[PDB]
């Protein structure tokens, strides 16, 4: 299972969740930005690691980070 | 058994096939069919 | 394959042992080891 970490530089423009193809990410309430929301990763067991969230992140450097960890059936994306 | 005709090896193999292999397969296949539930 | 050196019967048996018997045992034992629970 990979690790998806969300850092405090989040602006809450929800682009990582919309770029997510595996329903890993969701928006939770937060107080550290103007949009008052931070990305969260409650479902990293379904994380394939394809880093579409990191492409969609507009902040510098990144507010979301995917670290490729142990490979399972779900993370290797196998239909077999 | 000899033969001056061409493909004289064909009765060498078809006589024991139509004679033995064809009845053993077919009567074998018919014995499963006519006695199946 | 001949040989004027002594123990020329030893490459007669060690070449098919290192060539065949050593990998079939080792990759045999590795296949059980890397695929066991």
């Amino acid at each position: 299972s990979h690790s998806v970490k969300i850092y405090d530089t989040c602006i809450g423009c929800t682009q990582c969740v919309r770029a997510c193809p595996l329903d890993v990410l969701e928006m939770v309430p937060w107080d550290g930005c103007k949009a008052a929301q931070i990305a969260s990763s409650p479902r990293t067991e379904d994380c394939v690691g394809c880093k579409r969230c990191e492409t969609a992140c507009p902040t510098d450097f990144l507010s979301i980070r995917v670290y490729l960890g142990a490979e399972t059936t779900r993370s290797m994306g196998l239909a077999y | 058994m000899d033969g001056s005709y061409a493909a004289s090896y064909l009765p060498w193999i078809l006589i024991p096939m139509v004679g033995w292999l064809f009845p053993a397969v077919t009567m074998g296949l018919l014995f499963i069919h006519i006695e199946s539930e | 394959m001949d040989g004027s050196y002594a123990a020329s019967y030893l490459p007669w048996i060690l070449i098919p042992m290192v060539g065949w018997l050593f990998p079939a045992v080792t990759m045999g034992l590795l296949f059980i080891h890397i695929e066991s629970e």
Binding site: - | - | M1, D2, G3, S4, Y5, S8, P11, W12, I15
Partner: protein, 73 residues
Amino acid sequence: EQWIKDPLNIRPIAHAIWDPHFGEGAVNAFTQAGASNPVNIAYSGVYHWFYTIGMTTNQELYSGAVFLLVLAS
């Protein structure tokens, strides 16, 4: 022992070839350096190294190999 009597002419033999895939052409081609069997010519230079450091017999090279088996142990 054959090579040290003429190091400029005799080809140093690495080891013997034992390959069942060899035909009669390749047996006759690799039966070289005055040998009676298919051999590989040494190009590592160990013959020049062993002859310079005093080794002159196959008994000395054998005693060196057995000692290095013991030294590996």
